Amino acid sequence: QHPWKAPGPNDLRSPCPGLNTLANHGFLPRNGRNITIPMIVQAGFDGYNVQPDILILAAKVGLLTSPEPDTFTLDDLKLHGTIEHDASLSREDFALGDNLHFNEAIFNTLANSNPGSDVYNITSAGQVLKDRLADSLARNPNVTNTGKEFTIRTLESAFYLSVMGNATTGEAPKNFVQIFFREERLPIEEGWKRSTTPITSDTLNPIAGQISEASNWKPNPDQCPWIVLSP
Amino acid sequence: SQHPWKAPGPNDLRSPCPGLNTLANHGFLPRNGRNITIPMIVQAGFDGYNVQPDILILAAKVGLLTSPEPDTFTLDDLKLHGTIEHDASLSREDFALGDNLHFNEAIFNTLANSNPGSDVYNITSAGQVLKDRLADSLARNPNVTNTGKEFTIRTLESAFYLSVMGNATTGEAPKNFVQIFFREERLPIEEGWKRSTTPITSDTLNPIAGQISEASNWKPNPDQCPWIVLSP
Ligand code: HEM
Ligand code: HEM
Ligand SMILES: *[C@@H]1O[C@H](CO)[C@@H](O[C@@H]2O[C@H](CO)[C@@H](O)[C@H](O)[C@H]2NC(C)=O)[C@H](O)[C@H]1NC(C)=O
Ligand SMILES: *[C@@H]1O[C@H](CO)[C@@H](O[C@@H]2O[C@H](CO)[C@@H](O)[C@H](O)[C@H]2NC(C)=O)[C@H](O)[C@H]1NC(C)=O
Ligand SMILES: *[C@@H]1O[C@H](CO)[C@@H](O)[C@H](O)[C@H]1NC(C)=O
Ligand SMILES: *[C@@H]1O[C@H](CO)[C@@H](O)[C@H](O)[C@H]1NC(C)=O
Ligand SMILES: *[C@@H]1O[C@H](CO)[C@@H](O)[C@H](O)[C@H]1NC(C)=O
Ligand SMILES: *[C@@H]1O[C@H](CO)[C@@H](O)[C@H](O)[C@H]1NC(C)=O
Ligand SMILES: [Cl-]
Ligand SMILES: [Cl-]
Ligand SMILES: [Cl-]
Ligand SMILES: [Cl-]
Ligand SMILES: [Cl-]
Ligand SMILES: [Cl-]
Ligand SMILES: [Cl-]
Ligand SMILES: [Cl-]
Ligand SMILES: [Cl-]
Ligand SMILES: [Cl-]
Ligand SMILES: [Cl-]
Ligand SMILES: [Mg+2]
Ligand SMILES: [Mg+2]
């Protein structure tokens, strides 16, 4: 019913492996266009068993990246400073290169994490957050690192652990996480199953909280958290 | 003819916005103030006032943050302090000091009495009102929030009352039209008000808000980061 197909050149994609994977399976429109908030809620439920609370807020902020009244394209979501942030797991900082497309060299840090284990977990996820921020601080003179970016980065790490793995423990098989990022594909052939446990603020926040404590974080002085309001 | 004024009944929801409240009171928006989508705001702003989508779409997307629903808000949701609703309102009390939702004559007194001895409000009077209303909040509200975000919104709101009740090009409005708009949330059609024949856009509003800004004698509160409260 929902086969994987690589996006063609008319097919718009985002910096989000979550939404890109849903589009690549037709849970969202395969062209990544004309997406409403209710379409996000239904796709997150259908693909991942993610519940509306977190999706509705993310989607309302996503709408700010679009000139349209009540839809965005996946490509709109690249707008730097709305949701898109520096120290991404698999994308370059906007200031240093391409903030939109999967990049293997950036992904290397997450790929190689939890060395010697068959899983990623909260400990490895925190170490990756720390290493990816340190890389941005070392190479990007324009890095934006406030409470807003940090909260989002901990919830994004909670999402990859939760959707590709176990939503209760935040432990995920490495091969599922690698396919999710590298191919934006549900690893069904490799044994991945949609969570039987609803994924909610109440499951994600405890995981994001533990990842937070394992990240050793401090905000940049002199930066006010902000949501860029227009493209 | 198709859009008569009716006072809201006791279960009709209203906002801190005379703009949206007036549209609801004429049925350009649902008279009950419920189930408002972004397209409904765009159509109502066009139909009532000849206001174009650019500014309405952004305001409505931020308004959605005040609602727990996927793609609608009520007019009453928009009272959420720190999303759009701000201190030093023209016609409402600060959230910290009282009622941030309902029209209040004692607050409105400053705008009512502005440009003394003239029959119009204009950019100069609008700036003096912004200065006096912020001075009042700084004096009486220990919790006043006064950043570039609240100031920009306050200048655009004053550009809106001048533009919709008056001349969208000059930002001059008849005092009578402005007083009816705030006090009754009614289009003063009986008293001679006509919908702009000139589209009201970011390009007409921003120059007026800019000149109101320069006439406001404004400075930000220094320790405060601009923020949009993301949930109720
Ligand atoms: C449905 C479940 C979701 C999952 C599992 C998910 C997962 C993720 C993950 C793991 C990242 C990190 C990518 C990286 O750092 O390289 C990410 C980033 C992002 N997501 Fe999502 N996401 C979801 C929903 C959403 C929604 C609803 C929106 C917006 C409407 C959104 C917008 C973004 C954006 C703009 C980024 C880029 C942040 C950055 O710069 O890395 N996501 N998402
Ligand atoms: C359509 C034309 C509009 C006009 C002419 C207009 C006009 C105004 C005016 C003059 C005020 C100031 C009230 C005061 O300070 O006492 C105001 C406040 C407000 N407006 Fe609007 N508005 C419009 C559209 C909107 C839209 C689309 C939204 C939200 C979706 C909105 C939300 C608000 C809010 C929340 C306030 C309260 C701010 C405060 O004083 O604390 N307005 N509006
Ligand atoms: C994440 O996985 C790693 C690797 O399995 C865990 O760290 C190891 O924990 C074992 C089991 O107690 C220790 O004996 C090893 O010495 C640890 N190795 C390293 C390099 O850390 C880690 O505990 C896991 N984290 C969570 C929250 O489950
Ligand atoms: C707004 O209206 C006021 C009052 O009419 C204007 O200020 C007056 O301007 C006249 C003629 O230019 C001066 O001679 C008066 O002394 C001013 N009166 C007061 C009360 O100050 C003001 O210029 C108008 N502003 C704009 C931008 O049109
Ligand atoms: C997820 O982890 C919990 C807690 O260890 C476990 O009981 C549950 O069976 C796991 N879920 C699946 C489907 O494996
Ligand atoms: C209007 O809004 C509420 C949510 O606040 C919804 O549950 C209700 O069904 C809607 N009613 C109509 C008539 O659309
Ligand atoms: C100011 O805000 C704080 C935090 O919300 C609140 O507890 C306090 O009562 C407020 N103080 C005044 C005088 O409004
Ligand atoms: C608005 O002001 C302009 C510039 O003075 C004027 O030419 C125009 O006619 C005014 N509009 C109306 C309907 O009076
Ligand atoms: Cl961008
Ligand atoms: Cl930048
Ligand atoms: Cl590691
Ligand atoms: Cl970190
Ligand atoms: Cl299969
Ligand atoms: Cl902005
Ligand atoms: Cl109605
Ligand atoms: Cl409130
Ligand atoms: Cl307050
Ligand atoms: Cl005055
Ligand atoms: Cl908030
Ligand atoms: Mg990024
Ligand atoms: Mg107010």
Numbering used by the authors:
A (entry chain B): 9 to 239
B (entry chain A): 8 to 239
Task: Give the original sentences from the paper that presented this experimental model.
Unspecific peroxygenases (UPOs) are a class of heme‐thiolate oxygenases from fungi that have similar catalytic scope to P450s, but are dependent only upon hydrogen peroxide (H2O2) as the external oxidant. A recent survey by Faiza and co‐workers explored the diversity of UPOs within sequence databases and was able to identify two major groups of enzymes: ‘long’ UPOs (Group I), typified by AaeUPO, of approximately 45 kDa molecular weight, and ‘short’ UPOs (Group II), typified by the enzyme from Marasmius rotula (MroUPO), which are of approximately 29 kDa. In this study, we have cloned the gene encoding an ‘artificial’ short UPO (artUPO) close in sequence to MroUPO, and expressed it in both Pichia pastoris and E. coli. In addition to their overall similarities in fold, artUPO, MroUPO and HspUPO feature both a glutamic acid and histidine residue (E164 and H93 in artUPO) that forms the catalytic acid‐base pair, in common with CPO and in contrast to the Glu‐Arg dyad found in AaeUPO.
